[PDB]
From a paper:
The Zrt-/Irt-like protein ([name]) family consists of ubiquitously expressed divalent metal transporters critically involved in maintaining systemic and cellular homeostasis of zinc, iron, and manganese. The ZIPs import metal ions, including Zn2+, Fe2+, Mn2+, and other divalent metals in the first row of the d-block region in the periodic table, to cytoplasm. Here, we present a study on a prokaryotic [name] from [name] (BbZIP) by combining structural biology, evolutionary covariance, computational modeling, and a variety of biochemical assays to tackle the issue of the transport mechanism which has not been established for the [name] family. The findings, in particular the structure of BbZIP in the apo state and a biochemically validated outward-facing conformation model, consistently support the conclusion that BbZIP is an elevator-type transporter where a four-transmembrane helix (TM) bundle with bound metal substrate slides as a rigid body against the dimeric domain composed of the other static TMs to implement the alternating access mechanism.
Author numbering:
A (entry chain B): 5 to 149, 159 to 309
B (entry chain A): 5 to 148, 159 to 309
The structure:
Amino acid sequence: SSLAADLRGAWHAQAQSHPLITLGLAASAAGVVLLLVAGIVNALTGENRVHVGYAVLGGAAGFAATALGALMALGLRAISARTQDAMLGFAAGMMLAASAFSLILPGLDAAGTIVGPGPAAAAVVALGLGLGVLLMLGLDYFTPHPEAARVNRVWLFVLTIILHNLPEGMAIGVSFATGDLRIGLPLTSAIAIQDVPEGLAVALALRAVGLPIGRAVLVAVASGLMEPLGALVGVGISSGFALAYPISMGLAAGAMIFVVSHEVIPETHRNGHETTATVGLMAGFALMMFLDTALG
Amino acid sequence: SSLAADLRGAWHAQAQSHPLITLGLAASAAGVVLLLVAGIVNALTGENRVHVGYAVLGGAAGFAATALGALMALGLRAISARTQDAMLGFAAGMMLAASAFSLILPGLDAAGTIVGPGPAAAAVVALGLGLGVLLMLGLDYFTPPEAARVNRVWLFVLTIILHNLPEGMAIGVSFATGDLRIGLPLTSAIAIQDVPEGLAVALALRAVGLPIGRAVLVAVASGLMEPLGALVGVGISSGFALAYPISMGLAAGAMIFVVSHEVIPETHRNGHETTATVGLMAGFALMMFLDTALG
Ligand SMILES: CCCCCCCC/C=C\CCCCCCCCOC(=O)[C@H](O)CO
Ligand SMILES: CCCCCCCC/C=C\CCCCCCCCOC(=O)[C@H](O)CO
Ligand SMILES: CCCCCCCC/C=C\CCCCCCCCOC(=O)[C@H](O)CO
Ligand SMILES: CCCCCCCC/C=C\CCCCCCCCOC(=O)[C@H](O)CO
Ligand SMILES: CCCCCCCC/C=C\CCCCCCCCOC(=O)[C@H](O)CO
Ligand SMILES: CCCCCCCC/C=C\CCCCCCCCOC(=O)[C@H](O)CO
Ligand SMILES: CCCCCCCC/C=C\CCCCCCCCOC(=O)[C@H](O)CO
Ligand SMILES: CCCCCCCC/C=C\CCCCCCCCOC(=O)[C@H](O)CO
């Protein structure tokens, strides 16, 4: 009846019930660890020369944006679901444009120069892109959605609340892996716009579980530490070999498209203000497209 | 009766009872926050071009060493206090030599080229060096019956997670120049330290009342402060030319305070005083030996 046994049993249960999601998670997990090892072994042997500095400031900004919203949960009055859906809807739009125009596109240009700009450029991004979708489909499924029992769920809840921002951080690290501000700033800022609404929501979600407002906020602030930590994971997976960057550019794109469509867009519609949320999605997408078009 | 109010009152209480420890902490905190902003503003305006990469892999090693020791708390049999005193005494010896020979020395050479190798070199490390002692004295002093017993398990786990941030900033400061002869000795010294305290942190949480697995899970997560702290360490070393030698001193003072006032008392508490002391000698001597070999 230890939560370790509870996790192993539930993980056994879902692996039996969803074998392809489970197999697709095993493969993606394997790739991430392999590109990470490769990127560490490359570093240990000299010769790496990645751009960690910009990724570290990028991850830190995200820490602050999460905290910012986390602290909005102590304010007086309230923020209606109506305003949150627009805030979350706008961010989801900038996040869609960013993984299209700041990660999938440059990742083709990346893989273009190594292996050829044809179907060979397209199939290297795809290896990442499908791998990122499968990665976050498995984490969605192998993550949770009566005194001793009720407590362990607060544990299983707080831990996926803490970790869930690691991918958003790894996308940040991958955009900045070449130190290119035109690749990085659009993505990093788009995740920072998203972090404010999710910071508030993460915090209020914890208060709903039963933590007093202050620990609930302190846990919400600690959630943003995964984006500095993830950015470190992102730079290392981009860097074992020449093909690791475009694969990773693809994998971050896949991870971020899955999170928006299958996780955040349902949050906007669940509150019921469907029209205002999707018009934001258009506004977020269009303006992000405009800014990448301007800076080129 | 909220835990926020309980912390605010106790911080008011300790600031009244220890005014110089309190002002000495206000001052040190101030410098670190200032050297960080300065170091970030430097990057945002271009011109920084430091390589965090070396500090990042160093911080990652520390994560693993803490995790390593944390997971030893699931083992069969047990590890005697006698063996733990030797492990911790040896590490404290390597940490003293390292902040002497890998942080204070190079920090003098640093301030040497900037302002001169006389008393001008010595007073720039010292500004930092006293600032590191003052920083870790204040953190020692300002960190710690149903509703009451729980808020201390909260305040306990919270300082348990945070306590490695300074050990992490020392790592970032050794590597702030990407010089492996400064960096490797220091970070390896803390990684040797990280294994024994990882075991202790895990067992200490289990003694508080967390089941063995969450106690181990919290212990593993404590090691994340050394990657994160190392980022803080790179930013304070880098606002201006004098920020590096100050920070070399500031980590040295912070690390000397932790060894002498925190790690050495732990080794004696279990009672095997002699073995801890010759270990500390062995750790110091070999570390000196390796710095002399590496030059
Ligand atoms: C738009 C396309 C939609 C298609 C979605 C399905 C994607 C497939 C998901 C995961 C496949 C992972 C690729 C490696 C498979 C090798 C399985 C080889 O077999 C194995 O390794 C098993 O252990 C066999 O038991
Ligand atoms: C930023 C997030 C990155 C985190 C990466 C780690 C998270 C999840 C870790 C592991 C997933 C393991 C799933 C086990 C499936 C085994 C059945 C099927 O096993 C298999 O079929 C094997 O392929 C054997 O051939
Ligand atoms: C509990 C709180 C823990 C805090 C967690 C977040 C840590 C991040 C905080 C500050 C990061 C500043 C380090 C970057 C300094 C060098 C800029 C890098 O710029 C560069 O040097 C580039 O190479 C330029 O080319
Ligand atoms: C308690 C720990 C500290 C937490 C505080 C977090 C500080 C927030 C840090 C940076 C905000 C802006 C970062 C932008 C990404 C890097 C752009 C770099 O861009 C540039 O280089 C210039 O635009 C031109 O060079
Ligand atoms: C390695 C290269 C891989 C090649 C491409 C494979 C990528 C897989 C692409 C898309 C899979 C995402 C759709 C997820 C379907 C199940 C979610 C649905 O979950 C649900 O919510 C239920 O249906 C109930 O509503
Ligand atoms: C909860 C788990 C989340 C993960 C927590 C973070 C701990 C692991 C952090 C980083 C692992 C990879 C280090 C960076 C690899 C890039 C080498 C650095 O690049 C370089 O080597 C430079 O170019 C010079 O050496
Ligand atoms: C890596 C760990 C670094 C963490 C640093 C942040 C933690 C420090 C937190 C709070 C500082 C304590 C303030 C004490 C007030 C004394 C009033 C006296 O105030 C004053 O009169 C003037 O400010 C003197 O300068
Ligand atoms: C051993 C731990 C290792 C490192 C831990 C670093 C994380 C930081 C841990 C605790 C934070 C201490 C800050 C307390 C501020 C007290 C000022 C309060 O003063 C006041 O509020 C009065 O107004 C003063 O007059």
